[PDB]
Amino acid sequence: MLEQPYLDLAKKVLDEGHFKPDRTHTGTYSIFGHQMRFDLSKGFPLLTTKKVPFGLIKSELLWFLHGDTNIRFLLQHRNHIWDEWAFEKWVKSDEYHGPDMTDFGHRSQKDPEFAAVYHEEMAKFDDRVLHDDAFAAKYGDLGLVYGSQWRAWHTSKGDTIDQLGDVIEQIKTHPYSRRLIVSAWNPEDVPTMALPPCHTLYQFYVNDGKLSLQLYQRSADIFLGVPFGIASYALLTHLVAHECGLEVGEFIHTFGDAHLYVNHLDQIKEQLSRTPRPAPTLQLNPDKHDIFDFDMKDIKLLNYDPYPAIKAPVAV
Amino acid sequence: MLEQPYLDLAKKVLDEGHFKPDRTHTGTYSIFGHQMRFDLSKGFPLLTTKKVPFGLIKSELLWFLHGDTNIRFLLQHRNHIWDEWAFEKWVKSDEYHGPDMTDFGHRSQKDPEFAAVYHEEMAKFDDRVLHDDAFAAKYGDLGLVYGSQWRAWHTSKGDTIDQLGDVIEQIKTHPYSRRLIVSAWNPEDVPTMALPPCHTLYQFYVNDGKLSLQLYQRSADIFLGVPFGIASYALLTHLVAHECGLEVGEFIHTFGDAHLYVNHLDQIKEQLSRTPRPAPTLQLNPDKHDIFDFDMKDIKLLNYDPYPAIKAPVAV
Numbered sequence A, B: 001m002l003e004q005p006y007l008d009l010a011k012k013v014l015d016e017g018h019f020k021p022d023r024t025h026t027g028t029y030s031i032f033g034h035q036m037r038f039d040l041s042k043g044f045p046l047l048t049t050k051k052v053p054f055g056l057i058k059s060e061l062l063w064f065l066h067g068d069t070n071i072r073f074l075l076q077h078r079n080h081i082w083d084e085w086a087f088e089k090w091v092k093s094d095e096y097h098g099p100d101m102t103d104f105g106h107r108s109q110k111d112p113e114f115a116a117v118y119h120e121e122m123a124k125f126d127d128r129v130l131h132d133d134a135f136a137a138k139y140g141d142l143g144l145v146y147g148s149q150w151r152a153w154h155t156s157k158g159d160t161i162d163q164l165g166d167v168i169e170q171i172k173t174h175p176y177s178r179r180l181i182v183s184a185w186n187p188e189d190v191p192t193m194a195l196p197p198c199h200t201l202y203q204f205y206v207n208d209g210k211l212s213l214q215l216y217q218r219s220a221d222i223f224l225g226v227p228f229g230i231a232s233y234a235l236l237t238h239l240v241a242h243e244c245g246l247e248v249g250e251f252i253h254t255f256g257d258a259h260l261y262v263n264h265l266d267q268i269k270e271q272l273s274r275t276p277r278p279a280p281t282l283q284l285n286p287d288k289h290d291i292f293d294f295d296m297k298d299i300k301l302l303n304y305d306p307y308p309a310i311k312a313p314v315a316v
Ligand SMILES: O=c1ccn([C@H]2C[C@H](O)[C@@H](COP(=O)(O)O)O2)c(=O)[nH]1
Pocket: A023, A195, A196, A198, A199, A219, A220, A221, A222, A224, A225, A226, A228, A229, B177, B178, B179
């Protein structure tokens, strides 16, 4: 079944997984060096053993494709994944004249009252980002995020490079190249970044009229992270392919530190007791071609019949 | 046997290998996405099924470790791997007042007279690089090569970053980090580089007091390239480990485009008819610790009993 590699990877971290400490002082079962492949011709690798929000995955990838880094786009799309990061910048700022917020996330877990307070301050921050144009420009712009790494790499000459744009043209004029690489890792920025790119780098490959993509993920949260990651990059492999008039090949997910937080063990076992149903089908608008111009309505997901969602706490 | 993964990878490219064109207009049998691991506690993965020059591998890695990019060091060490690149720069220069040299490499294959001519001009170039200090500074400095990528990454602020130095300190003060990454890929330089880094990026990992390393090689020549690559990075895993007082773990080689040139098929088959002997043993000088200060004499290779070398033409 299409999503087997994932379950396999999951089962493995449990079995061969060696305990290992980490930043968000929780424990993890980790493995180092893994690689799994998904033959995109057999279907879309969005998990059926647990409900994954394709809407979220879809709007995030577009945000990246637009070379956008401001949270406003996502919010307009009911997407709040990157919310914490902008909120945090806001709170550490001179203007934040509100309640105690330092460590809002980790605190909310065992909230002394926090729950509503945090959740409301956040509602406020967002609401302003959506309307106060100047506020959005200030606290709503994350800066160095995938959108800017992929499409506006800052060069030593104060210029900007559209890695993705260039690779796409390359694919068209030189499909057999081995230099079709887009990179999110900048040695200059990581020493002072909030969260250095987990999706460190990806390579494209063309053969027999099919497009393939390999991702190198330096670090991954098997439970919460991987499900989206596989969905996100498989989508990209289709999008880029659609634009180049190529057939879709394989999506390959390679790992550095693949781990499962100690507070996710029961949940994952639950999942491992499920039987994958047939994988869904992706449908891209035939009329449109420049993916940089793709809109949500141009991406349909057909036949996604999943098992109920699984709730598990974010380890912090 | 330790080197099995390599033979396995080799056998595979023959069997599942899909023909694919390439730059040096020759043909290739290619696969996309492969990963193999070598448990460095079982021995050193320097091939016994064919003689690999450990001396060359050793002096090259030191050259990188010194953050050096001038060919003089290598020549002083009888190492000529990077010779062509500096020679080419020399020939395309105003000063090169010699015979016809444009395409020296590919031509030498079916030399109309070239052999000696090229080989002598080269001897001249080198000889000068070794003695004429100003010549070395001019035509002997390659510039952007591993030594500068690893230890003097040029930032947008005209400064320089010692990625390797920083990662080593990191390993010591934060061994459980998932950000121990050194990168040779610069989106800014690749568009105008002679040869963008095949050894694209590598990640370190520490667990149970052992050090592991994973390399991401965007493109590889299974026959001529991989044998050195495995040797080079396994050596680094030992060196860094020796410096951090860690035990050696696994070396993991991940691949983008792994290929075998069509003009290497017979030779590789020859190799595949050999039986691996026990792997050699690496011995590092116990007295020395700062690997940036390691000298050739500080690296011993014990019990290397290989099969005679295999000669095969460099495809161009
Ligand atoms: O697809 C993804 C992207 C990010 N993360 C995770 C990786 C780490 O678990 C955490 C960040 O902590 P560090 O890896 O930076 O140390 O976020 C994932 O799990 N999956």
